[PDB]
Amino acid sequence: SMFLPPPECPVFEPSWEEFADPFAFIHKIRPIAEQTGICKVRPPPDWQPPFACDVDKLHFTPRIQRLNELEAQTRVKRDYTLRTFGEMADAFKSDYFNMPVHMVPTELVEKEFWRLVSTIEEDVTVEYGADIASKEFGSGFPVRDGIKLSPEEEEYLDSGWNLNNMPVMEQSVLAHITADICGMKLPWLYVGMCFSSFCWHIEDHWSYSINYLHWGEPKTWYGVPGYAAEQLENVMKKLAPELFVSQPDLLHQLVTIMNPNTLMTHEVPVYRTNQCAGEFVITFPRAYHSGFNQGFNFAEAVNFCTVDWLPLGRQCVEHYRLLHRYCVFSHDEMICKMASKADVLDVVVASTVQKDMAIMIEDEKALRETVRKLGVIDSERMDFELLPDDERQCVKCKTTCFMSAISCSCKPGLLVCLHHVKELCSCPPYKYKLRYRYTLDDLYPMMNALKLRAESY
C-alpha cells in the first residue's frame, strides 16, 4: 502493498506580466512555496520554447541504477544515441506492464515504483542520462552560436526562463562568482526512462533549483520544506546509518531512495507532483527532494541563488564546517567579489550583500581577536583566491579558506581555519602565521561602497 500518495504541492499559473520576471515571481510565491519545499509553475499557454534535435547525433554514456530502498547510492558528475536510449526505454516500460507505453496510468507507475524498491526479491535495473551541456549533447533551450537561428529561437534566447540565462541575470548572486564552479552555474541535462530516479537530497550550498521538462512522459517529485530538513535527516539516520558516515570527497556523497510514507509516519511533511512536459519545478533552499521518471523524457535543470538565499548560504557553510563537508565555493570570496563590483550591482542586491558583509566583518573581527589571544602574533596578507581549492581547505573541517587561515612553517602548504587553530601541529602558536586576505581597514570601505550603491535612488 500500500502507498498513500502525499498531498499535492502548490501549482502556479502566472500571467504574462507575472511570468516576465522569474526572480520577482519566485519572490512573490516564496511565502507559500517555502512551506512545501517544491512547487510547480505552468508557464502562459503561448510561452513555447522550440525544441529541435537530431536523435541520431546526440550521444551519451548511460548510468546504471539498482532500484533498492535504503541502499547507498553515489551522486556522480557504454554509449547510447538519444534514439537507441528511447527504443530501449520504450521496450522496457511496455514489456514491464505488457501495455502500450502511453496507456500505463501514472498512479500505477508510482504504486509499482514503491513496491519494486521495497521488495528484496525484485532485481530491477534501469539506466539514465545525467550531465552538463557539451558539444556531444547540448542545451534543450536556444543558445547563441557563431549557426543562423530562426526567429522562434531568437525570442527565447534572452528569456529569463531559458535556463542558460537564469544564472547570469542581475537578480542572481552565483552570477558574479569568477571561480570554476561548472556544476553550479551550468545547466544539467537528464535523459530519463521508466523508474530511473533521483535519491533524497538538497542542493549544494542550500541553493534553489529550477527544472524544466522539455518533452516526454512525466517526472514524479516528492518534496520536503526547508524547515523540516533536520527532522528528515534524523529519520534517515535511524533507518539508514551507513549513509551518514564521513566521506573522503564531495564526489563520494551517499544518497538513498526512501518511501515518502515512512517520512510521513515520522511526522515529516511531504508533498508530491507529476511534472509534465512544458512545466517547471522549483526547489527552495534546504528543501529535500526525490522522485522518479514515468517513462522516456528529457529535462534540464540549474541551481540559482537569490538575495533572499544569502543568509542561508552563510548558515550552510557554517553547517558544512560542523559536518567536515567540502564546499563548492567560498561564500566570503563571493561576497568580497560583489563588494569589489559595488558600482555595477543591482541596488537591491548591493543592499542585501552589505547586510551579509556586516555579519562577516563582525565574525572575522571576533575570530582574529581570539587567535591573537592564543598567541598567534605574526601575520602576512595572502591572496587566497589564487590558490586551487584543494590547496586552501582547513585540515580539520575542510572549509574553503578565504578571509583568513593559520599556517606553520613545519607543515608546508597546510592550513587551518580560525576555528581550528589547535589542529594544525604541535608547535607553540608563536611559530604560526595568520594569513589574511584583507585587514579590517580594507573591509569597511568595501562595505561603504555597497551602502552608497544601495542608497542611490
Ligand SMILES: [Mn+2]
Ligand atoms: Mn527491490
Ligand SMILES: [Mn+2]
Ligand atoms: Mn536536486
Ligand SMILES: [Zn+2]
Ligand atoms: Zn576549520
Ligand SMILES: [Zn+2]
Ligand atoms: Zn608547526
